[PDB]
Scaffold this active site. Structure first.
Site, short mmCIF file in Angstrom:
data_model
loop_
_atom_site.label_atom_id
_atom_site.label_comp_id
_atom_site.label_asym_id
_atom_site.label_seq_id
_atom_site.Cartn_x
_atom_site.Cartn_y
_atom_site.Cartn_z
N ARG B 164 0.81 -1.22 0.00
CA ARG B 164 0.00 0.00 0.00
C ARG B 164 0.84 1.27 0.00
NH1 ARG B 164 0.06 -2.34 4.96
NH2 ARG B 164 0.61 -1.06 6.79
N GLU B 174 -8.00 -4.62 7.27
CA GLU B 174 -7.79 -5.94 7.84
C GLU B 174 -9.08 -6.44 8.50
OE1 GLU B 174 -4.46 -8.08 8.54
OE2 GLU B 174 -6.42 -8.99 8.16
ZN ZN Z 1 -1.83 -9.80 6.01
#
Ligand code: ZN
Ligand code: ZN
Lengths: 307, 307
Positions: B164, B174
């Site tokens: 990223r 996440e």
């Molecule tokens: Zn991961």
């Protein structure tokens, strides 16, 4: 009334799929210190069946090690193009078999793990095995009230190839849910308790604590249900929330089973209420099994004792 | 009030690690069905970062793709023994950067799943970035009462080589707990919601919506804690059942950390309180992180508006 001779040879297999950690952890430990699985009279032998897969924490190398124990692949001539798992299965069938022989090991407990919400589960490869029905009844009874479900997978048209199928007395000891490549202390303790009550059963069946007649509730495999998939090959929907983690609970024709990202809901269908097992198991996305349909019934066992 | 340039180029990265299924699925769905992520004015582009690892449903082919975006690797010349992921990282950059240049994509979301039970988690790489602090506050508000914690990274090491990191504004999404190689419906619905709100924030922000000052709770990584490992380098103890699945839940100098198979206890002890993250993640045992300890703090953002 059945009468069988004392069980002598016991092999506990761990790591047939190297990424199902529990089985690995225990066999590692026991080999090191074998007091937990020691029983007088028995030669309980812990053993790893795929160091290479375990060493790299992966399921398999070339092909599923639990699909090549059919005499067909066991009597295959050795070469170089030969699958690793085969080079290992032939060695296993030699050390702990040969498959279906008086030399065959007496009992093989092959330890597995599942990512599905199945809980304590036992696998029987023969509804006509009174010795195993008694062992399973004994385990369920001793572990009560902690459930220890029995999955009956028998119909000879689909039962004839597994690492433990060389055992004069094979037993599958599944334990999940647990992400592959993860160790949960709770799952480790459960797999150990199941084995504790089983190995004890063998020493008792020997000591003459003849067992009374009795049956067990089991789940009999009907058929596998794949994931609806796009003309492409990848799936087009995900296990419905209400079904997610609901292994063993009856499903009705109109209950939601899959759901697409668009939000469409696909119900069970059919005309009968079934019991779902191995719901959303990671290893089965490729085997084409979103879950397995089984039927719930009873299995009686004649009273037994040792000769 | 903090001024700002109207964000335009936004990417959605799914499949950095090939077996984190949610991203693999949502981005595949958003590449054909883009409406959900469509915000009039944006060029919102969904993208699969490691397709070869996705085709094998494996974390990575050679090395971790999410750890090779450092400068040395992006400008590295190709060599025969160089990991595939290093070559794939140059391609991702050749399309979404150049990393560290005016031409860098404005916002790239990188989707990830964790076998750990930490709920929804936003990863922040700049503890002073008012724009991201605002976006995260916006998302948290829209998701309440669902928990949505913030993992802040301060050390340059564990953040400058991330996938990223190529964009102007990096965002790590996440969602756990989810066993790898599995697609849960509830997890899919969650990550997609956090995103829907992340994109709404961006469109509104561009449309001049002035955002007043705000503040959020954050958990800054302190240090990793590896599993005890006997001489032979094998795992000596496992996550204690009281710590297992208890991410973000503050520990105290007494709460037991590990447990061996013989029943040994290894509590934290130490010298203070901590917030254990990535407790028993699946793609971490290698990194030697049974869980990572963090510190808790609040970040205040000034008001912001587009120029
Ligand atoms: Zn991961
Ligand atoms: Zn398996």
């Amino acid at each position: 009334c059945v009468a069988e001779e004392p069980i002598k040879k016991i092999a506990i297999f761990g790591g047939t799929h190297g990424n199902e950690l529990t089985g690995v952890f225990l066999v590692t430990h026991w080999l090191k210190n074998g007091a937990e699985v020691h029983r007088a009279g028995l030669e309980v032998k812990p053993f790893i069946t795929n160091p290479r897969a375990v060493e790299k924490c992966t399921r398999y190398i070339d092909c599923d090690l639990n699909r090549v124990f059919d005499l067909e692949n066991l009597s295959k001539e050795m070469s170089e193009d030969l699958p690793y798992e085969v080079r290992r299965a032939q060695e296993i069938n030699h050390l702990f078999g040969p498959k279906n022989s008086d030399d065959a090991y007496d009992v093989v407990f092959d330890l597995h793990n599942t990512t599905s919400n199945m809980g304590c589960t036992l696998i029987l490869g023969d509804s006509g095995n009174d010795f195993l029905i008694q062992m399973f009844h004994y385990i369920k009874t001793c572990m009560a009230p902690l459930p220890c479900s029995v999955y009956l997978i028998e119909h000879p048209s689909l039962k004839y190839a597994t690492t433990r199928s060389i055992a004069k007395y094979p037993v599958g000891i599944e334990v999940g849910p647990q992400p592959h490549g993860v160790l949960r202390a709770d799952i480790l303790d459960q797999m150990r308790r199941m084995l504790k009550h089983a190995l004890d059963f063998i020493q008792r069946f020997n000591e003459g604590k003849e067992f009374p007649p009795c049956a067990i509730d089991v789940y009999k495999i009907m058929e596998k249900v794949d994931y609806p998939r796009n003309e492409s090959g990848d799936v087009a929907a995900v296990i419905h929330p209400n079904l997610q983690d609901q292994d063993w609970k009856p499903l009705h024709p109109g209950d939601p089973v899959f759901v697409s990202l668009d939000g469409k809901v696909i119900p069970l269908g059919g005309d009968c209420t079934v019991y779902p097992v191995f719901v959303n198991e990671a290893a089965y996305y490729e085997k084409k099994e979103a879950f397995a349909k089984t039927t719930k019934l009873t299995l009686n066992a004649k009273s037994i004792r040792s000769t």
